Amino acid sequence: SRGEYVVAKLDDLINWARRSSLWPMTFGLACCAVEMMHMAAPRYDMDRFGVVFRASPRQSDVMIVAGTLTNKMAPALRKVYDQMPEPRYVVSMGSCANGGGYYHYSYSVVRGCDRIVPVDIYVPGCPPTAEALLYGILQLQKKIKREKRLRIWYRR
Amino acid sequence: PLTLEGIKDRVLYVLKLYDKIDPEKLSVNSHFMKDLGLDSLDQVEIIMAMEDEFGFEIPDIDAEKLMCPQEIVDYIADKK
Amino acid sequence: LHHAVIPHGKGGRSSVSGIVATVFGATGFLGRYLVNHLGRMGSQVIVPYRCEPYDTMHLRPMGDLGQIIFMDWNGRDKDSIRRAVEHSNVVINLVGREWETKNFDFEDVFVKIPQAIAQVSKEAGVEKFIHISHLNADIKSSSKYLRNKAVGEKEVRETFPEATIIKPADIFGREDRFLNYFANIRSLGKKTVKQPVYIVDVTKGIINAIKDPDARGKTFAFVGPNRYLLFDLVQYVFAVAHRPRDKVERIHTTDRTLPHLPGLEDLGVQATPLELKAIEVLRRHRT
Amino acid sequence: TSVKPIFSRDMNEAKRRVRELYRAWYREVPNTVHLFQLDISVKQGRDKVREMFKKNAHVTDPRVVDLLVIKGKMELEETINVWKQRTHVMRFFHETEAPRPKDFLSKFYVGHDP
Amino acid sequence: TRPTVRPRNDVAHKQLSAFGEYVAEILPKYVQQVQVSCFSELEICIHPDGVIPVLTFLRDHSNAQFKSLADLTAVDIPTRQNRFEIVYNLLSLRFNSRIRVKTYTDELTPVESSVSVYKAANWYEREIWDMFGVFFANHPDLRRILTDYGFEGHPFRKDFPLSGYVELRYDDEVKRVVAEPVELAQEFRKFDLNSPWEAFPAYRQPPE
Amino acid sequence: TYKYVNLREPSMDMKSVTDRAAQTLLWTELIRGLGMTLSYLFREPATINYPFEKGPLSPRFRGEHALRRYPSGEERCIACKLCEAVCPAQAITIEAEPRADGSRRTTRYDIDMTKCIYCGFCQEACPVDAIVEGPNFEFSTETHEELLYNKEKLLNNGDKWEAEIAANIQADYLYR
Numbered sequence A: 001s002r003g004e005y006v007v008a009k010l011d012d013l014i015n016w017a018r019r020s021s022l023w024p025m026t027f028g029l030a031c032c033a034v035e036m037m038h039m040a041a042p043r044y045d046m047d048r049f050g051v052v053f054r055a056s057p058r059q060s061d062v063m064i065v066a067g068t069l070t071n072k073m074a075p076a077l078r079k080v081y082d083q084m085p086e087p088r089y090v091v092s093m094g095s096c097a098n099g100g101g102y103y104h105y106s107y108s109v110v111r112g113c114d115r116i117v118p119v120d121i122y123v124p125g126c127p128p129t130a131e132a133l134l135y136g137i138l139q140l141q142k143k144i145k146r147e148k149r150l151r152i153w154y155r156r
Numbered sequence B: 001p002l003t004l005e006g007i008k009d010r011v012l013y014v015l016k017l018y019d020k021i022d023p024e025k026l027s028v029n030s031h032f033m034k035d036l037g038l039d040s041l042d043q044v045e046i047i048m049a050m051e052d053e054f055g056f057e058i059p060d061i062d063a064e065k066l067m068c069p070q071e072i073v074d075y076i077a078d079k080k
Numbered sequence C: 001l002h003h004a005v006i007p008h009g010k011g012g013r014s015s016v017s018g019i020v021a022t023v024f025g026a027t028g029f030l031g032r033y034l035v036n037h038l039g040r041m042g043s044q045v046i047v048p049y050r051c052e053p054y055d056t057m058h059l060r061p062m063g064d065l066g067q068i069i070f071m072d073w074n075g076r077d078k079d080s081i082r083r084a085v086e087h088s089n090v091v092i093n094l095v096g097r098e099w100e101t102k103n104f105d106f107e108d109v110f111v112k113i114p115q116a117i118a119q120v121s122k123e124a125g126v127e128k129f130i131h132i133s134h135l136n137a138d139i140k141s142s143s144k145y146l147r148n149k150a151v152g153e154k155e156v157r158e159t160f161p162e163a164t165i166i167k168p169a170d171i172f173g174r175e176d177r178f179l180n181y182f183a184n185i186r187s188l189g190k191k192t193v194k195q196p197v198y199i200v201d202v203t204k205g206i207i208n209a210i211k212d213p214d215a216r217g218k219t220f221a222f223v224g225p226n227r228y229l230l231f232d233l234v235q236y237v238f239a240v241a242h243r244p245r246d247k248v249e250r251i252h253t254t255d256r257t258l259p260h261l262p263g264l265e266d267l268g269v270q271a272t273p274l275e276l277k278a279i280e281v282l283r284r285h286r287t
Numbered sequence D: 001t002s003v004k005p006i007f008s009r010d011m012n013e014a015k016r017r018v019r020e021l022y023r024a025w026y027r028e029v030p031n032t033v034h035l036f037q038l039d040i041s042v043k044q045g046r047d048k049v050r051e052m053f054k055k056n057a058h059v060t061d062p063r064v065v066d067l068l069v070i071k072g073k074m075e076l077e078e079t080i081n082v083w084k085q086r087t088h089v090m091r092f093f094h095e096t097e098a099p100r101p102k103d104f105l106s107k108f109y110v111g112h113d114p
Numbered sequence E: 001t002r003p004t005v006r007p008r009n010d011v012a013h014k015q016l017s018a019f020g021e022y023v024a025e026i027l028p029k030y031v032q033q034v035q036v037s038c039f040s041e042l043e044i045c046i047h048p049d050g051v052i053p054v055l056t057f058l059r060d061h062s063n064a065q066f067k068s069l070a071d072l073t074a075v076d077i078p079t080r081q082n083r084f085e086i087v088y089n090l091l092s093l094r095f096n097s098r099i100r101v102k103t104y105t106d107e108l109t110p111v112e113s114s115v116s117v118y119k120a121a122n123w124y125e126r127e128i129w130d131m132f133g134v135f136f137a138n139h140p141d142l143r144r145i146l147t148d149y150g151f152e153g154h155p156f157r158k159d160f161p162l163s164g165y166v167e168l169r170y171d172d173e174v175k176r177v178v179a180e181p182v183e184l185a186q187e188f189r190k191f192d193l194n195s196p197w198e199a200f201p202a203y204r205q206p207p208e
Numbered sequence F: 001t002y003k004y005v006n007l008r009e010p011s012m013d014m015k016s017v018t019d020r021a022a023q024t025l026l027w028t029e030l031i032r033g034l035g036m037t038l039s040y041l042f043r044e045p046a047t048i049n050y051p052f053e054k055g056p057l058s059p060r061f062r063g064e065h066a067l068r069r070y071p072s073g074e075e076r077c078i079a080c081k082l083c084e085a086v087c088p089a090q091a092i093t094i095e096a097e098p099r100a101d102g103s104r105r106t107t108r109y110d111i112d113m114t115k116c117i118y119c120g121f122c123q124e125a126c127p128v129d130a131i132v133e134g135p136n137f138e139f140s141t142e143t144h145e146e147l148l149y150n151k152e153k154l155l156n157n158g159d160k161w162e163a164e165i166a167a168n169i170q171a172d173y174l175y176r
């Protein structure tokens, strides 16, 4: 079954190519943005994982929603989400963002970013420690390792 | 080509062109507000509709003082 | 019946509503809108997928916290399907690719898929099973599509007889097929009279029929409000859009009404016309 | 009892300012429904505008009428700019149900809403 | 009494007492209270008509300079007919002292829009208009800033509850974000912490 | 006391003005900045290899929200509701019942991981040190359902380790 063999090998190559660099965009509303800039710090690297912090939305591989989502924020957040290529992944960082959090019982606040965009990787904390966020990005990469898109396309 | 009767005829067919008026039933003493069952909301609709039709801005107090088709025609005959 | 299936309070966002719906499909168009309106109703939706979890990921956050649930199914085994329909209030069957594949024809998806799921459903004890079908799918010619759908219609009618066999007309919406082909043109001109029905009235009718009991057993058919020529509709599409073989035969084939079966009026939903929603959806032209 | 009103003397100036504000809303609607690339006919939007005006016609106190005029002027400014987005303008409308009628028996099925 | 309890200066108390007595004597038209707390920060409690005259006096006169403007809020106190309390806060660049000009007001009658003499009061007054509804006649621009546009209710009142009445969610039905009546996921529990037994005997109000 | 800046003048002497002209037309202190940055180039950079080397911490980190139990004994919690009385986002949810024995215990002890700001107030408020902020911080959870702990999840998470928790407490039961 060398057709299946070529499908599996080419799927491994393209998915490793996807998960290799993964340059994000840092949306970053509140102090979770400061902790993201602290995993941009010289101690906890991002060069090593091909991860280039970049404000460009047009080329965003993954998107790290961090800070505190509000009602005034949410349509502009999803407009940022729309002008984005369809292979895309979402890391919800922060207790505020992954379920409302400390401002859960309030007005003007969407109860977590689940109610706007889908979420692949939740990483909790206040702030989620830069070490823990980097672990969450590693488990994001392992989710990219298990995606089987070309397997489903071949045996579709 | 700008007389009183041409302005009254064009006011007549735009009163025909308005939808909720049933029927037109034009008169020099019509008073479409209460004798025809209309609202002051519809009064200001018709006033700024004539403004949209054929000219000048027709401000608020003169929009209030009309309440009547021929009085609109005579106010335009005063203003135009 | 047990508690936490009874309705609770108002509607929306994990207000415990009535039905627990096992949906087959839902990664496509109409199933996605149907999961959307059940999430507005606040109903738990058990959906199995077969594809990558990225598709069910971008249709994931429709529900509230943990309402809808995702699992796996396949078109071969009764064990995975039966495990998906172990505990279900209602179940809907929506499936079908509009071109034959390597491993599936128009036959045996429309034939073999309702057989096994209806088998494990009738051995399972589900209620209000709603099976979709294309309109005017006959024993007659011109489509393996339509004749395999007619065979599936006879199957779902014969075994498990109190299924709501439902059929809309060819629906248009944000991700229509035939209006997209009207956009993806070049040409040719024929004649066919045709009524288009918008998608949200269809899925509102489906959710109302699935939440309203005593309306069971009867097959339903949805009606477009205009019912005029196809080529005039193509001229309308080019006019509103500012620019001057299986799918084209299956739109030129047959479009009629049937006086036998009841439609919109026994449900109480307002019909949205072609013109309003068509002006709403015909974006993406030149400026 | 000394009370200093905003603008009013009787309800004549109230009627005058509210009819001028409605004229401003009439010439406000088509520019905005063309600018925001909206999806609603002009007749429906104008009828919902005049329905929102006809909701609060039961107020005779002139200070309250003055404060309503000032609020409507504020939102007419904030919609004649591009400061408010598509979301707030659709939020004025109700196209997402919200289906709840005022029948007794309908509220008796989905209960505990007297 | 001396360790770990903050000592005070009676000298500053006497200075602020004499100064407040002086201001109360020389603007008799609007002075109702001149109260001095234990730690010497002055409070002047004012009828809602002398806003512009008292602030034009207190900006100048070379005995009370007080150029620095701070907070404005109108502390929502029910069990009154004049509910809201407009609190001007003034700091002297020349004298290093803090005076709190508390003028009282009701729900619907405006105080006289202090932005004419205080250029810092513009967004302060816009904030108070947005959160409360205290109207400000003779003001350049009143808008809603620090709230959503389509939201209304004047939420920092006590009549507005903790959660909002509206709650957004995206839906794919009309392909956009809509507001719904609030469906909380949990209660926001309410702890009856107002314990009895009179922790301060000096602040006892006379009962009936 | 004050020590202010920017009180000088450009010196009118010929040497100082031709030095400022030399910096203007010769690009000197720019190259001095290049020299300083190359001096940081020739250092060894201070990075940590993340999956193998984990960054240092304190014995009093606030992580996992684990539970403890008695020496060969039962559950350390009494359900005395102090942690839910102090929980500043009210993420604790305690419903208590006694069992057939007679000692007072629980039914439902839920931590919302969304609302948990990780203060430490429930650690300081616990009279018997039942709930302890844990040592490890790796949650990284793909689903929002899985971020709502039950009491049995907390007992499994307190029985996956105590020796870390016991070592940290036995080192630092004297400060707090």
Ligand SMILES: NC(=O)C1=CN([C@@H]2O[C@H](COP(=O)(O)OP(=O)(O)OC[C@H]3O[C@@H](n4cnc5c(N)ncnc54)[C@H](OP(=O)(O)O)[C@@H]3O)[C@@H](O)[C@H]2O)C=CC1
Pocket: C024, C025, C026, C027, C028, C029, C030, C031, C049, C050, C051, C075, C094, C095, C096, C097, C098, C104, C109, C132, C133, C134, C135, C167, C168, C169, C170, C171, C172, C177
């Ligand atoms: N105008 C119209 O389009 C009308 C359509 N209908 C019917 O409505 C249904 C839904 O239509 P539509 O959304 O446009 O089409 P889709 O192809 O998108 O819907 C079918 C769904 O079932 C899945 N599926 C199909 N075949 C297989 C297979 N062999 N194995 C596994 N999964 C399969 C699809 O992809 P995946 O596997 O990735 O989930 C999808 O989720 C169809 O059955 C169609 O005949 C009826 C009337 C009008």
Ligand code: SF4
Pocket: A030, A031, A032, A066, A067, A068, A094, A095, A096, A097, A101, A125, A126, A127, A128
């Ligand atoms: S979770 Fe904590 S650190 Fe992050 S935005 Fe909220 S308050 Fe800031």
Ligand code: SF4
Pocket: F076, F077, F078, F079, F080, F081, F082, F083, F084, F094, F125, F126, F127, F128, F129, F130, F131
């Ligand atoms: S404070 Fe400690 S013992 Fe008391 S209820 Fe909370 S965890 Fe249990």
Ligand code: SF4
Pocket: F083, F086, F087, F088, F089, F090, F091, F092, F111, F115, F116, F117, F118, F119, F120, F121, F122, F123
């Ligand atoms: S650390 Fe978490 S569980 Fe403990 S009191 Fe704070 S919010 Fe509540």
